[PDB]
Design a protein around this motif. Structure first.
Motif, PDB file in Angstrom:
ATOM      1  N   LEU B   6      87.513  61.034  44.121  1.00 44.84           N
ATOM      2  CA  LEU B   6      88.374  61.374  45.260  1.00 44.84           C
ATOM      3  C   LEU B   6      88.107  62.787  45.765  1.00 44.84           C
ATOM      4  O   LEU B   6      88.118  63.033  46.989  1.00 44.84           O
ATOM      5  CB  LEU B   6      89.849  61.187  44.888  1.00 44.84           C
ATOM      6  CG  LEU B   6      90.208  59.743  44.531  1.00 44.84           C
ATOM      7  CD1 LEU B   6      91.717  59.526  44.461  1.00 44.84           C
ATOM      8  CD2 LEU B   6      89.521  58.763  45.552  1.00 44.84           C
ATOM      9  N   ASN B   9      84.834  62.477  47.791  1.00 45.51           N
ATOM     10  CA  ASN B   9      85.111  61.861  49.083  1.00 45.51           C
ATOM     11  C   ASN B   9      85.795  62.835  50.035  1.00 45.51           C
ATOM     12  O   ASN B   9      85.459  62.898  51.221  1.00 45.51           O
ATOM     13  CB  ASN B   9      86.011  60.647  48.901  1.00 45.51           C
ATOM     14  CG  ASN B   9      85.383  59.571  48.048  1.00 45.51           C
ATOM     15  OD1 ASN B   9      84.182  59.613  47.747  1.00 45.51           O
ATOM     16  ND2 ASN B   9      86.207  58.601  47.628  1.00 45.51           N
ATOM     17  N   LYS B  12      83.297  65.299  51.265  1.00 45.80           N
ATOM     18  CA  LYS B  12      82.365  64.651  52.193  1.00 45.80           C
ATOM     19  C   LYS B  12      82.976  64.491  53.589  1.00 45.80           C
ATOM     20  O   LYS B  12      82.305  64.774  54.592  1.00 45.80           O
ATOM     21  CB  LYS B  12      81.931  63.300  51.621  1.00 45.80           C
ATOM     22  CG  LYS B  12      80.557  62.821  52.157  1.00 45.80           C
ATOM     23  CD  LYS B  12      79.983  61.692  51.279  1.00 45.80           C
ATOM     24  CE  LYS B  12      78.780  61.045  51.932  1.00 45.80           C
ATOM     25  NZ  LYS B  12      78.493  59.684  51.382  1.00 45.80           N
ATOM     26  N   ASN B  13      84.236  64.034  53.672  1.00 40.64           N
ATOM     27  CA  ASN B  13      84.966  63.985  54.942  1.00 40.64           C
ATOM     28  C   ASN B  13      84.918  65.322  55.660  1.00 40.64           C
ATOM     29  O   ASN B  13      84.580  65.392  56.849  1.00 40.64           O
ATOM     30  CB  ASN B  13      86.453  63.630  54.732  1.00 40.64           C
ATOM     31  CG  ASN B  13      86.724  62.135  54.557  1.00 40.64           C
ATOM     32  OD1 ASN B  13      86.056  61.279  55.150  1.00 40.64           O
ATOM     33  ND2 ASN B  13      87.786  61.819  53.781  1.00 40.64           N
ATOM     34  N   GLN B  16      81.165  66.381  56.729  1.00 46.59           N
ATOM     35  CA  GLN B  16      80.565  65.602  57.821  1.00 46.59           C
ATOM     36  C   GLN B  16      81.243  65.912  59.151  1.00 46.59           C
ATOM     37  O   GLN B  16      80.578  66.038  60.203  1.00 46.59           O
ATOM     38  CB  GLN B  16      80.682  64.119  57.492  1.00 46.59           C
ATOM     39  CG  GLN B  16      79.787  63.725  56.296  1.00 46.59           C
ATOM     40  CD  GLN B  16      79.956  62.266  55.889  1.00 46.59           C
ATOM     41  OE1 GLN B  16      81.063  61.708  55.946  1.00 46.59           O
ATOM     42  NE2 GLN B  16      78.860  61.646  55.450  1.00 46.59           N
ATOM     43  N   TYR B  17      82.576  66.037  59.103  1.00 44.64           N
ATOM     44  CA  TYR B  17      83.371  66.439  60.256  1.00 44.64           C
ATOM     45  C   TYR B  17      82.942  67.813  60.763  1.00 44.64           C
ATOM     46  O   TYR B  17      82.731  68.011  61.967  1.00 44.64           O
ATOM     47  CB  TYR B  17      84.838  66.439  59.803  1.00 44.64           C
ATOM     48  CG  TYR B  17      85.925  66.607  60.838  1.00 44.64           C
ATOM     49  CD1 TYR B  17      86.192  65.591  61.764  1.00 44.64           C
ATOM     50  CD2 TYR B  17      86.756  67.728  60.829  1.00 44.64           C
ATOM     51  CE1 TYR B  17      87.213  65.718  62.691  1.00 44.64           C
ATOM     52  CE2 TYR B  17      87.808  67.858  61.779  1.00 44.64           C
ATOM     53  CZ  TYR B  17      88.014  66.837  62.698  1.00 44.64           C
ATOM     54  OH  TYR B  17      89.029  66.908  63.633  1.00 44.64           O
ATOM     55  N   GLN B  20      79.659  67.790  62.664  1.00 41.18           N
ATOM     56  CA  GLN B  20      79.854  67.457  64.087  1.00 41.18           C
ATOM     57  C   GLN B  20      80.409  68.626  64.895  1.00 41.18           C
ATOM     58  O   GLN B  20      79.989  68.857  66.041  1.00 41.18           O
ATOM     59  CB  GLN B  20      80.771  66.256  64.261  1.00 41.18           C
ATOM     60  CG  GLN B  20      80.603  65.630  65.626  1.00 41.18           C
ATOM     61  CD  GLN B  20      79.196  65.115  65.814  1.00 41.18           C
ATOM     62  OE1 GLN B  20      78.692  64.364  64.980  1.00 41.18           O
ATOM     63  NE2 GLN B  20      78.550  65.515  66.911  1.00 41.18           N
ATOM     64  N   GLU B  47      90.704  70.991  68.986  1.00 41.28           N
ATOM     65  CA  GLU B  47      90.595  69.546  68.764  1.00 41.28           C
ATOM     66  C   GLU B  47      90.360  69.226  67.300  1.00 41.28           C
ATOM     67  O   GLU B  47      91.040  68.368  66.725  1.00 41.28           O
ATOM     68  CB  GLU B  47      89.471  68.898  69.573  1.00 41.28           C
ATOM     69  CG  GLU B  47      89.610  68.833  71.041  1.00 41.28           C
ATOM     70  CD  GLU B  47      88.403  68.158  71.656  1.00 41.28           C
ATOM     71  OE1 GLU B  47      87.440  67.847  70.909  1.00 41.28           O
ATOM     72  OE2 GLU B  47      88.427  67.908  72.871  1.00 41.28           O
ATOM     73  N   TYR B  48      89.351  69.861  66.694  1.00 43.68           N
ATOM     74  CA  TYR B  48      88.998  69.519  65.323  1.00 43.68           C
ATOM     75  C   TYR B  48      90.127  69.849  64.339  1.00 43.68           C
ATOM     76  O   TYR B  48      90.260  69.184  63.304  1.00 43.68           O
ATOM     77  CB  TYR B  48      87.687  70.218  64.951  1.00 43.68           C
ATOM     78  CG  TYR B  48      86.458  69.442  65.386  1.00 43.68           C
ATOM     79  CD1 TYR B  48      86.064  69.410  66.724  1.00 43.68           C
ATOM     80  CD2 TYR B  48      85.684  68.736  64.457  1.00 43.68           C
ATOM     81  CE1 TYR B  48      84.927  68.689  67.141  1.00 43.68           C
ATOM     82  CE2 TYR B  48      84.555  68.024  64.857  1.00 43.68           C
ATOM     83  CZ  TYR B  48      84.176  68.006  66.198  1.00 43.68           C
ATOM     84  OH  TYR B  48      83.051  67.299  66.590  1.00 43.68           O
ATOM     85  N   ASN B  50      93.174  69.122  64.644  1.00 50.70           N
ATOM     86  CA  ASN B  50      94.146  68.044  64.511  1.00 50.70           C
ATOM     87  C   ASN B  50      93.923  67.211  63.253  1.00 50.70           C
ATOM     88  O   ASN B  50      94.807  66.430  62.877  1.00 50.70           O
ATOM     89  CB  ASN B  50      94.094  67.125  65.716  1.00 50.70           C
ATOM     90  CG  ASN B  50      95.423  66.498  66.013  1.00 50.70           C
ATOM     91  OD1 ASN B  50      96.383  67.204  66.298  1.00 50.70           O
ATOM     92  ND2 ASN B  50      95.507  65.174  65.894  1.00 50.70           N
ATOM     93  N   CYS B  51      92.752  67.332  62.625  1.00 52.81           N
ATOM     94  CA  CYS B  51      92.510  66.674  61.349  1.00 52.81           C
ATOM     95  C   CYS B  51      93.582  67.080  60.358  1.00 52.81           C
ATOM     96  O   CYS B  51      93.878  68.269  60.195  1.00 52.81           O
ATOM     97  CB  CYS B  51      91.141  67.047  60.796  1.00 52.81           C
ATOM     98  SG  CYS B  51      90.971  66.451  59.118  1.00 52.81           S
ATOM     99  N   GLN B  52      94.383  66.130  59.905  1.00 48.02           N
ATOM    100  CA  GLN B  52      95.613  66.470  59.140  1.00 48.02           C
ATOM    101  C   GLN B  52      95.329  67.188  57.823  1.00 48.02           C
ATOM    102  O   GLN B  52      96.236  67.724  57.228  1.00 48.02           O
ATOM    103  CB  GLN B  52      96.409  65.206  58.860  1.00 48.02           C
ATOM    104  CG  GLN B  52      95.724  64.283  57.876  1.00 48.02           C
ATOM    105  CD  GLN B  52      96.541  63.041  57.632  1.00 48.02           C
ATOM    106  OE1 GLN B  52      97.683  62.938  58.062  1.00 48.02           O
ATOM    107  NE2 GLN B  52      95.946  62.077  56.958  1.00 48.02           N
TER     108      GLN B  52
END
Lengths: 147, 147
Positions: B6, B9, B12-13, B16-17, B20, B47-48, B50-52
């Motif tokens: 976990l 992961n 990695k989220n 990768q985000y 971008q 914008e980015y 807003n990723c909680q």
């Protein structure tokens, strides 16, 4: 490739977490037998359903009866037949499966990822974990950054 | 091995985000120069963010000047020197880096994952994206399933 990446990551999170729940249920059955074990499944489901990205978890036995759910508003489902082809597939083949659904929880139709993992004790299927997971979160967050 | 999975992961989220985001800032530089693309960066960070799972994103230029933050409580940080060793390392090595910190945002000291990724145009570092990410959530999720 960002969409593919974030969706794979979400699904990996759910499946590894779900594998641990399966291991836990198997071990309670090992230790206590079916009668006294089936009484600890609810608490394990409730623990695991406290993850943010999970809309609901259900445990369904060999005869497709919904034994436990984590969403209180679905308590009338307990002891009903699941009547679910993907659940039946998981029970019959002893293998996990998944599919996307559209489901309206009260906010409009949302994309939801359904994951089934069967519980095996001593290599035989005793039941199935059914998970509705909030994969729409990923879709939303991609939309937020125009990806 | 669930804790490792976990945590991996989650990272990695975030990475990768952030890649971008890095691509997006580079392309604005490419097209608009640096004297016409140093005012839209703020919108991309907003914008980015807003990723909680992101606590803050900062963009920091070659001279270590904090150009932009997504945290309204931290507007005064703008135009100051970052004074940050990991940012210095990303600028000088031209590669990403990461470390864990403890930070108290109002609720006690939380585990926070800090990720830096430099921004490169014409193959030269023009700046660096600093991210604080809410990896504490993962630890809490693990502790809730006694894992």
């Amino acid at each position: 490739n960002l969409e593919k990446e974030l969706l794979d990551n979400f699904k990996k999170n759910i499946t590894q977490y779900a594998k641990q729940l399966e291991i836990s249920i198997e071990k309670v059955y090992d230790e206590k037998g079916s009668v006294n074990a089936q009484k600890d499944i609810q608490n394990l489901l409730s623990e695991y359903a406290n993850c943010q990205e999970i809309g609901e978890i259900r445990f369904i036995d060999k005869d497709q009866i919904i034994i436990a759910t984590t969403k209180q508003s679905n308590r009338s489902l307990i002891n009903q037949k699941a009547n679910d082809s993907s659940v039946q597939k998981a029970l019959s083949l002893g293998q996990s499966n998944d599919h996307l659904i559209l489901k309206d929880y009260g906010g409009g139709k949302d994309r939801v990822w359904v994951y089934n993992i069967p519980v095996k004790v001593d290599k035989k299927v005793i039941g199935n974990i059914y998970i509705e997971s909030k994969i729409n979160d990923v879709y939303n967050q991609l939309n937020n950054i125009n990806q």
